[PDB]
CSV table of C-alpha atoms and ligand atoms in Angstrom, one decimal:
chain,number,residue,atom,x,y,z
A,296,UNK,CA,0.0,0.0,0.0
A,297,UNK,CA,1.3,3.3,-0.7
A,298,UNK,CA,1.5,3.9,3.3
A,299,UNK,CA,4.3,1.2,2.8
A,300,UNK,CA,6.1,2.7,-0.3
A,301,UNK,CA,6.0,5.7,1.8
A,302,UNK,CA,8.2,3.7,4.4
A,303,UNK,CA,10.5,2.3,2.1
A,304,UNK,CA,11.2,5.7,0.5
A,305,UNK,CA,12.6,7.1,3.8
A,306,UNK,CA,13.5,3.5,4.5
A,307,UNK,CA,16.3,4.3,1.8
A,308,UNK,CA,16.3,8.5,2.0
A,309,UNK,CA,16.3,9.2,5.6
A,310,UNK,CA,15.8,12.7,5.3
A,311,UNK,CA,12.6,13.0,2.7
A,312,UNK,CA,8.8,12.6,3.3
A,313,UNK,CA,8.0,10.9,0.0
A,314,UNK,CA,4.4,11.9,-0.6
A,315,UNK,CA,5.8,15.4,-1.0
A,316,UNK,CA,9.1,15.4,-2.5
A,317,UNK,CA,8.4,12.4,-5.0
A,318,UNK,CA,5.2,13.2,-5.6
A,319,UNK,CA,4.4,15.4,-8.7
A,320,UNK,CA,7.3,15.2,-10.4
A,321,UNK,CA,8.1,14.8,-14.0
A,322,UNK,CA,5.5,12.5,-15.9
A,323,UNK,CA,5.3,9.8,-13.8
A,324,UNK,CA,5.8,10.2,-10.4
A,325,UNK,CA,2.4,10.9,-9.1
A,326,UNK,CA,-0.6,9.9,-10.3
A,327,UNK,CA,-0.6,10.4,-13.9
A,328,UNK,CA,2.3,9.0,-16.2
A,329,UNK,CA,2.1,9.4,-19.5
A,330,UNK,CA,4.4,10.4,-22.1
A,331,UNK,CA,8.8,10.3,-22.1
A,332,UNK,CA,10.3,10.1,-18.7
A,333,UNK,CA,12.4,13.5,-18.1
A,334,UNK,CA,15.2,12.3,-16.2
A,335,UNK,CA,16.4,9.0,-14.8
A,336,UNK,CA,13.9,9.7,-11.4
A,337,UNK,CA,11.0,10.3,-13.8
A,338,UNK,CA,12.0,6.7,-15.0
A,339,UNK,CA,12.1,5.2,-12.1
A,340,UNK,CA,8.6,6.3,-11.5
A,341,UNK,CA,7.8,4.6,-15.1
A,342,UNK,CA,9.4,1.7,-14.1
A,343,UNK,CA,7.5,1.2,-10.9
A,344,UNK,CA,4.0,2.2,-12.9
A,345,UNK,CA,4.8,-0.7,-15.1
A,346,UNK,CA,5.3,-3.1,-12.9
A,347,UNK,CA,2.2,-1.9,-10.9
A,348,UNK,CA,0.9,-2.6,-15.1
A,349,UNK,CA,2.4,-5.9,-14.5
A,350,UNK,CA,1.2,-7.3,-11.5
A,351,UNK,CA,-2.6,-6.5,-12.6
A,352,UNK,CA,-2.2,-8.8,-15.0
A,353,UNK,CA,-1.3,-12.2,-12.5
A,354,UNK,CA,-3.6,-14.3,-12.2
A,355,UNK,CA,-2.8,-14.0,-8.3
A,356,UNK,CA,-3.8,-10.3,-8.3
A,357,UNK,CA,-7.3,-10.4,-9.6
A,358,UNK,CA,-8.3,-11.6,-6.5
A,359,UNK,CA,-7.7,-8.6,-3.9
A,360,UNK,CA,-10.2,-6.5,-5.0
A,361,UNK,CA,-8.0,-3.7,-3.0
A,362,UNK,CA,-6.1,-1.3,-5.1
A,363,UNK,CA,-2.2,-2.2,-5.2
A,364,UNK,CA,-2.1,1.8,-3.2
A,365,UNK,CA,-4.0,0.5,-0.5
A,366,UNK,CA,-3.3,-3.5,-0.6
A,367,UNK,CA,-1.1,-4.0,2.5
A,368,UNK,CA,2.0,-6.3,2.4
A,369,UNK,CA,4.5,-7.1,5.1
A,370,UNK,CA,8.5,-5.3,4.8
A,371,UNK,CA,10.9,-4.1,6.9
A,372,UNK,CA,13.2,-1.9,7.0
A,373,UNK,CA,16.6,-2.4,9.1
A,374,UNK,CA,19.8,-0.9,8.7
A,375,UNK,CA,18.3,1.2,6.3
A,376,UNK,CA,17.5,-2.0,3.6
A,377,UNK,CA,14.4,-2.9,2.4
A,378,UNK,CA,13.2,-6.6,3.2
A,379,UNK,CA,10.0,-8.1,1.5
A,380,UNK,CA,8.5,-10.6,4.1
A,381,UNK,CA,8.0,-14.5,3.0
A,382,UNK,CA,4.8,-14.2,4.6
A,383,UNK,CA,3.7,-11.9,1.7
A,384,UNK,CA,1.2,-14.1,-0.6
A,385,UNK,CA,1.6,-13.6,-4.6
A,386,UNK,CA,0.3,-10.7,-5.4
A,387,UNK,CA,1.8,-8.7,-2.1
A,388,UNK,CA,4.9,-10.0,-2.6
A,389,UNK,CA,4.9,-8.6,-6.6
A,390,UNK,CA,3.6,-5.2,-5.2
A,391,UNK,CA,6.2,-5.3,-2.8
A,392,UNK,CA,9.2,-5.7,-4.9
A,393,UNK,CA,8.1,-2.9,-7.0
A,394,UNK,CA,7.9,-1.0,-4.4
A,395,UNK,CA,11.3,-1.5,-3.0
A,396,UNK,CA,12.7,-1.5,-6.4
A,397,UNK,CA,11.4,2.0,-7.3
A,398,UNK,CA,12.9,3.0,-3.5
A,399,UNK,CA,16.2,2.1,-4.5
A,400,UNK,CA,16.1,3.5,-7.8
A,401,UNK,CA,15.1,6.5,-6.3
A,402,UNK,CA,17.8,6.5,-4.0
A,403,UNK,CA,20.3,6.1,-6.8
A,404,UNK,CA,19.2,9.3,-8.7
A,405,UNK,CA,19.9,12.8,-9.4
A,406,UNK,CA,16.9,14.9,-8.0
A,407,UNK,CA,16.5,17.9,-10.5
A,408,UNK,CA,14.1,20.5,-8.7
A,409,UNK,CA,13.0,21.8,-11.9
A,410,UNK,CA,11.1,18.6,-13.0
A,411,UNK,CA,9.1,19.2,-9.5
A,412,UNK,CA,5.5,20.3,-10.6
A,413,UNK,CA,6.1,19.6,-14.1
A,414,UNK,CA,3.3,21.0,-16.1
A,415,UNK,CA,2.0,17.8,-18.2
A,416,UNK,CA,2.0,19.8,-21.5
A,417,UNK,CA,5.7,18.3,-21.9
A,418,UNK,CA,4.3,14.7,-21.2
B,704,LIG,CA1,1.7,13.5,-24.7
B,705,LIG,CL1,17.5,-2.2,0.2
C-alpha cells in the first residue's frame, strides 16, 4: 500500500517525506504518467507504474479487490535495507518488490528540482 512505499522511500532517503518530494514530479511520479520520462527519477517512476501494469495482469492479483495503493504487504526496514516478508502471498509480494525496487532506484538518482511540478504539457 502506498503507506508502505512511503516507508521504504525514507527507508532508503532518511531525510525525505515521500508523498511530498516524490510526488508530482516529471511524468510519472504521481498519479498520472504518460508520455517520455524527463530524467532517470521520472523513469524510475515509469518503471514502478509498469510493474504496478504488470502485477494487474497475474492471475494472483485479480483476487484482492484492493487497489495495489492500499493493498497492505509485510517489509521491513533495518539498517536502512528494504526486506520483502515470505509471509507476503503472490500478489503482495509482486507489489512489494516494486515498491522496494522503485525506492532504491530512487535512492540512486539525481533529484533535479525543476522537473518538481512539471506541467503535463511536456508529457
Ligand atoms: Ca503526450
Ligand atoms: Cl534495500
Amino acid at each position: 500500500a502506498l503507506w508502505q512505499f512511503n516507508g521504504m522511500i525514507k527507508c532508503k532517503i532518511p531525510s525525505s517525506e515521500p508523498l511530498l518530494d516524490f510526488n508530482n514530479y516529471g511524468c510519472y511520479c504521481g498519479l498520472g504518467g504518460s508520455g517520455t520520462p524527463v530524467d532517470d527519477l521520472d523513469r524510475c517512476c515509469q518503471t514502478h507504474k509498469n510493474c504496478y501494469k504488470q502485477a494487474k495482469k497475474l492471475d494472483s492479483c485479480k483476487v484482492l479487490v484492493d487497489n495495489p495503493y492500499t493493498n497492505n504487504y509485510s517489509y521491513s526496514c533495518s539498517n536502512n535495507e528494504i526486506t520483502c516478508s515470505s509471509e507476503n502471498n503472490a500478489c503482495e509480494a509482486f507489489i512489494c518488490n516494486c515498491d522496494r525496487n522503485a525506492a532504491i532506484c530512487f535512492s540512486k538518482v539525481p533529484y533535479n528540482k525543476e522537473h518538481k511540478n512539471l506541467d503535463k504539457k511536456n508529457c
